[PDB]
A paper describes a structure:
To understand the activation of N-WASP by SemD, we structurally analysed the complex formed by recombinant SemDΔAPH and the BR-GBD domain of N-WASP. The co-crystal of SemDΔAPH in complex with BR-GBD yielded a structure with a medium resolution of 3.3 Å, which is attributable to the flexible termini of both proteins. Interestingly, the loop connecting helices 2 and 3 (208-GTSSTG−213) of SemDΔAPH is stabilised in the complex and can now be modelled. Despite the moderate resolution of the crystals containing the SemDΔAPH – BR-GBD complex, the interaction surface between the two proteins is well resolved. Comparison of the structures of SemDΔAPH alone and in complex with BR-GBD revealed virtually identical conformations of the SemD core regions, as indicated by a low RMSD of 0.7 Å. We found three positively charged residues within the BR domain of N-WASP (K193, R194 and K197) that interact directly with the negatively charged area found on the front of SemD, formed by helices α1, α2, α5 and α9. Additionally, five residues of the N-WASP CRIB domain engage with residues in the SemD binding groove, mainly formed by helix α4, the adjacent loop and helix α9. The N-WASP C-sub domain is located underneath the helical arrangement of SemDΔAPH, flanked by its extended helix α1. Owing to the flexibility of the N-terminal domains of SemDΔAPH and BR-GBD, these regions are not resolved in the crystal structure of the complex. Our structural and biochemical data further reveal that SemD provides the negatively charged patch and the binding groove required for selective binding of the positively charged C-terminal part of the BR and the CRIB domains of N-WASP, respectively, thus mimicking Cdc42GTP-mediated N-WASP activation.
Author numbering:
A (entry chain A): 67 to 159
B (entry chain D): 70 to 177, 180 to 272, 277 to 318
Write the structure that this text describes.
Amino acid sequence: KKKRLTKADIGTPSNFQHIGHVGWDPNTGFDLNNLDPELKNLFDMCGISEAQLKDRETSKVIYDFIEKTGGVEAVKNELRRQAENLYFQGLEH
Amino acid sequence: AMSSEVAKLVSELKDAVHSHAESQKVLKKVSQELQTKWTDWENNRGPDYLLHGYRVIARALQQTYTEQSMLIEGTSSTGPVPQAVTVAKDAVTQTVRGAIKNLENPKPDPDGVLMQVVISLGIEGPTLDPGESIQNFLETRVSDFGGDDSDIDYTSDIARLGSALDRVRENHPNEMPRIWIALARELGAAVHSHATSVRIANHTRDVVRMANESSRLLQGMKVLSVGAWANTMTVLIGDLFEH
């Protein structure tokens, strides 16, 4: 039988709700409920305001830096290394 | 906008309305490109379209794999594997082996609606709002792919998957990426096998660099509108696994 979505429907909006790439929307900025935790942690260490994350002009520049330096993956790996480093450095001989 | 304080209201709303309808113009151009290309490639290049469609999907399954790989808690089994996730992982294998079966070893007549749905689940599912019902997603998709008229009954397979995946999604949310990766690795093997068996029936091999084109246009759509991408993904899927 007929598939409701045919080639003429390409690009039409989904009737479902979607997270968004790297939790970022290019008009509304970062969705703060579905932001990544480790990315948030990075942003807090940088003093970045919730209003700067939700601003279009500034969130783009954050988004773009994050893509520059190796995507969210590199950031995650970095906070993680830092945590296992902080694990061994809490040890007292 | 005379006052200092109404001029900002005017400016902000001005901007909001414009850059919205501006981003709609963009999306529309990318859509119309992707539309004329796929339409032509279907109507001309016949089974090379099909062949590239698998690879565009195949590429999108691998992408959710590595994306969701980097959300998993510990690769180590830190306590007992909860019940809900064992049941979810098993449902992935069963619904996928059965979507494989409706298509390859049927009973008199091959049908691919089940393949199509779980493929959409595998690519599009990890992108859904955590609030979205996986049961509902799967139900909506058997209608969108035909299903209601088709003489196979899917209500058994959907409730297997929806039930299992939704139990994890609400009760053990941090374990969901574990299930998404499983779904993608099984789907990724399943697709690549369908691609290699459809290759056997006389074909231009390296002109399925279409794949790099579509996955370029689709990647542009995705950053503009994840939802629009998910819709045009399910359009591609609807042209696959049929006959």
